Amino acid sequence: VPDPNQGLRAEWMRGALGMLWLPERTFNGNIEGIRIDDFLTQIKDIRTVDYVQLPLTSPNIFSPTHVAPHPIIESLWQGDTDANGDPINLVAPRESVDDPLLSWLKALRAAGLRTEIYVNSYNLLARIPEDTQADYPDVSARWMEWCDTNTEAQAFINSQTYHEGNGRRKYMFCYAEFILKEYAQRYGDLIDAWCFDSADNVMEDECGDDPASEDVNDQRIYQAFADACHAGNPNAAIAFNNSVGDREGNPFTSATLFDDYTFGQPFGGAGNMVVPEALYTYNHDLVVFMQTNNGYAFRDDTRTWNDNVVAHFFPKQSTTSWNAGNTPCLTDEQFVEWTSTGIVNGGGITWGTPLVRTNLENAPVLTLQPYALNQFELTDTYLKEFQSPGKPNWSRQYTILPAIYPGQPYSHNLVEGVDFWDPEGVGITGLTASGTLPAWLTISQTATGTWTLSGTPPVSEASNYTFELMAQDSDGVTNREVKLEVISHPAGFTNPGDGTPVWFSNPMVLAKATALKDYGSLLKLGVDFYDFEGDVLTITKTSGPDWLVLTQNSDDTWRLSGMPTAADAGENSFTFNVSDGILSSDTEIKITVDHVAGFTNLGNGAPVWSSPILNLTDGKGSFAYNYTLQLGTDYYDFEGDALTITKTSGPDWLTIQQTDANSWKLSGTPINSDAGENSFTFNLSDDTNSTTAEILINVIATI
Ligand SMILES: [Ca+2]
Ligand SMILES: [Ca+2]
Structure with missing residues (x-):
């Protein structure tokens, strides 16, 4: 400090066009198996795009959730589960299952694209300590509990004097050394850029660093974060979000000693960056600033060391958010105009490009909105002709x-x-x-x-x-x-000579499935199946029970899914073929299906309820009552026989009707005369045997 390579390592960013590919709700193994290949096939015809921004962490309160495996983050999980059996407090993919980030990084490299990595500076620490997160309530506390109760951690904390201070400063250094550095060293030069959001919010406003200062001692957390990234790739470009600059001067807040490029948050808070109307002026003047200053952000001030720092903008294409949105904020003509003013002989723009549906829990469509592609392809046509004229x-x-x-x-x-x-x-x-x-x-x-x-x-x-x-x-x-480069074959495979695509082993034992639960297991190239000649491979299910569904995720990744029923209990055998078009080989796939826990097996072959007395939710006077009894939660058969529920006793108002194969609906309107505990009996019978249970609803009188 000051670095002679500061800003010079971000030289490629001048004239560079960027995109944003960001899935939401990445916790508890939701990110496991997720691929960028669909997005890359859609953007095939875009030839002037230079890089794509990927997450490491998610934004805001989702900052603890990671998309890359780490042993320290995995140990924070401790195997916690909910009512359904799904993980809780797992804020990373499991190291044994999948590395989704490495898959994206390699796919982007193969597409000829550089990478920018999003990390929220709050990270594993909770942004709002007063709030508890429903899917990961204990992670932030457990990260804190790890840092002041570890031999390797304390040796690092005590190693320097500046490590401890105001707020949660000691934990911030811990993330840089043990989490951030270990990530950067792993992926190497596959990561070209790092952008750190909420930098001033936590490092300045809480942990007492000064981003305006020229002194190295005032920017020690900034040093810790930058040096961690430079440990893996020394040429990696670093940006910190120290908020938007001045409308009446420099539109970027002045660089720290560790800023290679400007984060470049647009003017205005959440929502539309051009509405209200004044924000169009502010943000377009920012774009024009990049043009006037040839893509260098700070050649106006009285400082010498920041003269190579690249002017960079991080706008939203949509009216709502950075990673999603139904409506564009700029017109087709404006979008091309803004980008060309910004990058052509200027700086760089990472466009917040909207995907169709980013929520992984809600059937994710992780490809661009049709308008976002439309605006980008029109921009692509302009840059093809006008960015570098003459020579190819x-x-x-x-x-x-x-x-x-x-x-x-x-x-x-x-x-x-x-x-x-x-x-x-x-x-x-x-x-x-x-x-x-x-x-x-x-x-x-x-x-x-x-x-x-x-x-x-x-x-x-x-x-x-x-x-x-x-x-x-x-x-x-x-x-x-x-x-x-000469091909390096993975270990654990024997070359057949003739060039037949081979499986790892026959047979193959995978993770145990559970009845009435969605199954998740991956089949990856170089792990489970391999071709020694590198041909494009196809996997096919040839024989076995119907429940197991095979889907292709990418060229190197296949997904096994589907819901096994109660009938599928025990050991299940499958045959799977790996082919290249010429030659093929089969293997045996073995998945054991367990029964739903909680239900007691009587041995008589009879159906069973979850309890002798099912205590339902309270009812209200003159208000309509709804409760649905689902298979595998309230009632269960151990053979998977077709089940029928019929009323046997209890007050007239409550009646039962089948919604679907799994669920039966209880409906009716109780009145104030039915106040207190209401006793019901229902009979559950299959093709042969029958069983009864009590249903208890406490009807509350409305007064
Ligand atoms: Ca300067
Ligand atoms: Ca072959």
Whole structure:
């Protein structure tokens, strides 16, 4: 401090277009199996987009919830469960199950895109200590309890004098060293940028740091957070949200000693960033500021060290939120205008791009709103023609080639209009390479506009290649660095020789299913199934009980779901085929189905109720009463036989009727004359046996 590489490592952000892909409610294994591949297929034709912002933590009160596995965060869970059997206090994916973030990071890299990572600065600490979160009530307390009762933690806290101070300062340093650093070191250079929201809210307003100060001692939490990220990738760009700047001056609040780029929160609070009307002026002037200052935020002030800090904006495309929204806030013409003013010879914009449905608990559709794609494709057309005129433009940030498979036929296409284009529309007149190339590699035009890198490497090939790839139009040549890497096979698989796609083991024992509960198990490439030649693979269910449903999530991830009934109890056997189109191999899949807990098995083969007396919710005088009895909560059969509930005794007002296969509805209006405890008996009978239970409703008289 001060860093000579401050802002210079964010040099790529000048002229960069960004997007936001953010799912909501990521707690308790909801994020396990979630993939970005659907989004990337939808944005295929967008060729001028440079990066995508991903979460590590969620915003606001959802800051403890993580989308990446960590042993310290996983130990905070302690195996807590609810009434249904689902996890509680699990604010991360389980390390044994899935790393969803790594999947997205690799998929974005394969798409030729850089990454920005969202982390809310409040993190595992609770934003509102007075509030308790229904899905994770104890996590924040348990994180605090871990920090002042661990040998490795206390040795770090005591290691420096500045670590303790006002508020929850000691826990903030703990997150940077043990959680944030361990994450950054794992993913390496797959993360290009970090943005830290609510930075001033917790680091300044609670923990007593000064973001305005030039002194290193005043920005120690800022140091701890930045150095943690630089431990994994030293070239990672860092931003802190120290709120919006001044409308009557610099629209970005002045940089800390650890800001590579400006977080760039728009003017106005929640909701529309252009309505009311004055906010349009403020936020567009911010965009114009980026243009006037060539994408450098702080070349106006009297400070020398912040001269390379990149001007960057984080707006909302919609009228409501950053990650979702039904309505655009700007018109098609305005959206293109705002972006081009902001980035073309300016700075960078990460557009808060709305998805259809972000709630993972409510059938998530994690692809763009049709308008968001519409506005982005129109912007894409403009930037293709006008951002870098003359010489050819290479798409996005990287051009990624397939891995070298020794002895195997290599072939990859690079398409005009896709990987590269002449901005003026005459056309690409040729593509050649320069540098240390493979001897087997051939570059030729197979069709009009499509160039092919083909050939067959020898079995002895075990060296990586790095060379420039030159694309030509009538104006000149643009270079793009392309890499070739030899494939590294995962351990635990035996190469069959002939190139048959192989399963890990026969048979395969997966996690235990439970009756009347939605099952969740993943099948991942390089873990459960593998192809030694890297062909695109298909999994098929061939035999077994009907309940198990197979769905594809991505090229490397498949999901097993479905609800087993009471009839499916015991060991279940399945056959699953992995194929490449030529060759295939089968395996046996073994999933044990347990009965619903709480219900007592009599042995007579008879149905059973949850209790001898079912004490229902209170009723009200002259008000309509509703209660639904569900299978596996109130009543259960151990064989899975069709069940019928009939009334046998009790007051006239309450009657029963079947809603569906699982549920039976109790309805009727009680009056003030029916006040007090109301006794009922109901009979549950299948094809043979029968059983009775008492139902108790306390009718309250309205006075
Ligand atoms: Ca300056
Ligand atoms: Ca094969």
